[PDB]
Symmetry: D2
Subunit: 327 residues, 4 copies
């Protein structure tokens, strides 16, 4: 065997990872660390704000433990990760879902405190990134601290993985219309999101060059925040090396959707809207009808994704691959 894991931080990603981890039989959530929230408040946010609607099952809160469908889960309140008793409770893998310890120096504190491997759920500035379905086969057991990139990257990287392997991506620009999911001169972010299209920035397109090195330096992108929530979409516009018709691009994306990228890269040919993909375990759903082709080497591809939901499943997928590779 049972993979004894632990989760630092109990936010949107931390709660979504816990729900998926509780559904896996070979994974045992031993403890959770969050110094800000109380055990009863953690049960409230997991009851109503884990998945859409509310969780279906008994969720209680003991004096210092979360009881979710009988599974007693210890809760710690340590603001410094080096004080979390990962060793005493027997936690091997720590899912870093705080967004503040996203570098090797910070994530190492979990390893110093009794843990072995640390998987952070955010783009890192020094830890090797890994995207399930794209470069998880490149993982080797010597990597103690890795990363699973962000929301958009887990949607763009599989789509770009298929188009690059079949036709070759010469260069590509991306615009991701992002849902609600002043830190460094970000004046546009301080504006109210309600009733506002806010052009922001993301490093997802460049981070793709890190999970598939062939595309390094070949992709840039920006974001357009919209007042809606739940589901975001990726608008990839690339120049191809090999000419093609749209029918050949969609059938290549579909061929991988049913084979190697099963469960990660979805495919559809229906008149779908954003709310059709809420609660989807997919990381990227290609919209065949939405895409348009202007020349046999210049096409625009569109892919949906439900923010942190399908992403949080890939964290659990990556956790099992890293634990399996250490056998």
């Amino acid at each position: 065997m049972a993979i004894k894991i632990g989760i630092n931080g109990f936010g949107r990603i931390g709660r979504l990872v816990l729900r998926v981890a509780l559904g896996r039989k070979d994974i045992e959530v031993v403890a959770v660390n969050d110094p800000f929230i109380a055990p009863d408040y953690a049960a409230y946010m997991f009851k109503y704000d884990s998945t859409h609607g509310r969780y279906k099952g008994e969720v209680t809160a003991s004096g210092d433990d979360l009881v979710i469908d009988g599974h007693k889960i210890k809760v710690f309140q340590e603001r410094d990760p080096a004080n979390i008793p990962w060793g005493k409770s027997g936690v091997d893998y720590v899912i870093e879902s705080t967004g503040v310890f996203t570098k090797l120096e910070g994530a190492q504190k979990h390893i110093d405190a009794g843990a072995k491997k640390v998987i952070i759920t955010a783009p890192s500035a020094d830890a090797p990134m890994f995207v399930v379905g794209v470069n998880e086969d490149k993982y080797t057991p010597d990597l103690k601290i890795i990363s699973n990139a962000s929301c958009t990257t887990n949607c763009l990287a599989p789509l770009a993985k298929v188009v690059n392997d079949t036709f070759g991506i010469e260069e590509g620009l991306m615009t991701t219309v992002h849902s609600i999911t002043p830190s460094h001169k970000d004046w546009r972010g301080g504006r109210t999101a309600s009733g506002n299209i806010i052009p922001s920035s993301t490093g997802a397109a460049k981070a793709v060059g890190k999970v598939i090195p062939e595309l390094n330096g070949k992709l840039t992108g920006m974001s357009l925040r919209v007042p809606t929530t739940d589901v975001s979409v990726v608008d990839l516009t690339v120049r191809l090396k090999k000419a093609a018709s749209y029918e050949e691009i969609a059938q290549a994306i579909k061929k991988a959707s049913e084979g190697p990228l099963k469960g990660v890269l979805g495919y559809t040919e229906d008149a779908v809207v954003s709310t059709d993909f809420l609660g989807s375990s997919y990381s990227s759903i290609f919209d065949e009808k939405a895409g348009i082709l202007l020349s046999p080497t210049f096409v625009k591809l569109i892919s949906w994704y439900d923010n942190e939901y399908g992403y949080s499943t890939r964290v659990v997928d990556l956790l099992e691959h890293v634990a399996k590779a250490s056998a």
Copy 2:
């Protein structure tokens, strides 16, 4: 001495055109035709349904007329454009904002009803299209029915002009994020709830630019992403250039044209702006300089804002005055 005009249809487009024509001294409105609405219902839609703030002015509805700041507007409920008396009212120009008679077969019903030239405020595969700032100079007086394209086309064409005139447009894939505008199985996605939903849809705006810019014919196609917002939309143009350049050369070319040939039509800004920052703007296209990306010296993505039909409606009044000046 005054352009005696008239508006067929009192919708969101027609009410904004009536609002701009009053400010212009050379344009006088005398009649408004709308079958399904009443004069008192029209005074309510002009005062309040103008989704900005509120029309700061007295808006009264007489027995059969519309009083706005002391100006009488004869309201007609003719369901057929072949029965609205344009000649008895002396309205030489007709603004077709119904969106139903967007062809020469229907627009001619305004001509043989006493009026001279009628301009349709919607794309027309039957009538020649025109965009103020691009192909507006190629207007000829013998042409009696012209089209002012759509609000999206009036945003892409001014931008795609200065980019093609300076660097030359090779290809161009467009994405227009559109907010709530205005309205049978030709659009399944359209029959979905707009609230809390991202709805992709097609648009012929990029293909329409190929008509107002004959060089770009066949090099610009696009699609739309409807979002639940209100009066503000944006254009995400990804173009391959014919000549290598830097981003500051592209921004300086747009900034230069915004200060000269496209003054008032094409806007330029370098501020960290959001959508609501352009509420009620008279520009039809406003370039966002800080938002653009240059991946390679021939591969760029440009961003331009536009306030839906408001910047489009004031453009109809500009093209209308051009027809009067061209009537030699």
Copy 3:
């Protein structure tokens, strides 16, 4: 044994009833009728707009059938309800969900076409109205054409019953905030970014479902741009004095007894989306209510628009069949 039903109109309510009916074994949906949509279009709206998000099941369409998880359902396209082959299809009950044949004369056309009884999923101006949990026991088998009231009425009537039964309602004003050329000029305004005050006879219709409250209950509506989750705000003057604890404790007792599955009771810091896909007809919000005097209180109750209402339609359908035979 297994009741054979049919659905008129394939809109939001007709789709939600078909979904709940498929989940129950005692009901067998034989056919649907909608003269405006094609079979492939009815399958599209059922796949991506019946269940919130996406339906968990295969939804295809053949020539004149709507195959949903293997079960074939005939599809008619009759504008006149009297031309619908209900008799030869074996359908005994018709679910009138179009919203235009909501009177006795109009709904009769289903009976003229071979059906036995019709249930209108809308308030009716002449057909008898019944709400599950309030006056469902007042139904007699001789009633052929009944109404299931509104979705708002199905939220106010359960709450108003327990408050009137335990403490008695002297008077009561309510206000429901409803989530997403004409006679009313506010309805023509854009719903995006607007709180539009509208109106409904939901409170006056409570008098038809509990005759005591007839004439001493009225309210209005405030439309909000939210998505398919509304909440009723009821302000009543009580006849018997009480504390807020005693009002909430009684609502809880009925939620765990006679009104189980219909009236819900919560004490948590819940929000709109917490009742997404909720099977209840109304959920009392204990923390939201406030008491001013011992006989003057304000109560809050949520409901997921037409979801719990459609489950209630299926509930009323099985009760009528329970009483018809």
Copy 4:
């Protein structure tokens, strides 16, 4: 004659009161205090003033000052309100628009820094409370720290005054539809796509500005995903019997004389965004209110959140600083 003021905090309320302050001819803004923001960042937020449109004036940021229409306004970044050079800058009145220094022990630091009087733009548990048009004439110059309550209170108090003066309010329950140790858990939820019930406490605040209604009004709030304008739903029990026409006529006559400017009256089919930018404190919706009994009515009134409130702050400032009004 001329008064010199300063604004502590540069949030939405602080930015709105600054705009109305520049419009008047008597008040001259001297300096603004904000430790988190910068002078260059302050010009960016004031030029794009949230949901009110772009400012029609040259708003540039100089070296250490902020320039609007040529007027140079100093900017201080002192985190402590006692270390702000209000006296060295010649500031007399401090507009506490922060929300943290609402008590007397906190607001009096501005007095120790060189100012003479402080007006808090938030309901205070220690400072006396005033609402223009309701109890502004009861201000005595010996009061150096006062508050103008909340923007919700400025919508109910002028309405409750007119109803109570003519018909008398026995009891009143309120519900306001709001737009935009853990205490409130609902507040920590996503505002978009959610109706979030909250507690405003504005009705009990009317007991301070109207001592007669003390203990007769309590309310709650419903936060909806919108902006611009909010609404107030008042359900009062009257003392004297009256019809809805008598109530509407009493409000209309009040809004044309003693409350000309603060209270508004409309009979049109209005919506939310129709009051975007209204300087009124309350707009009675005559076409929306209903009457169940001659002494049991439900009144609805609109208010444009912080806009009219901020205008009402400058009215209180000139009323306090000058005896002419």
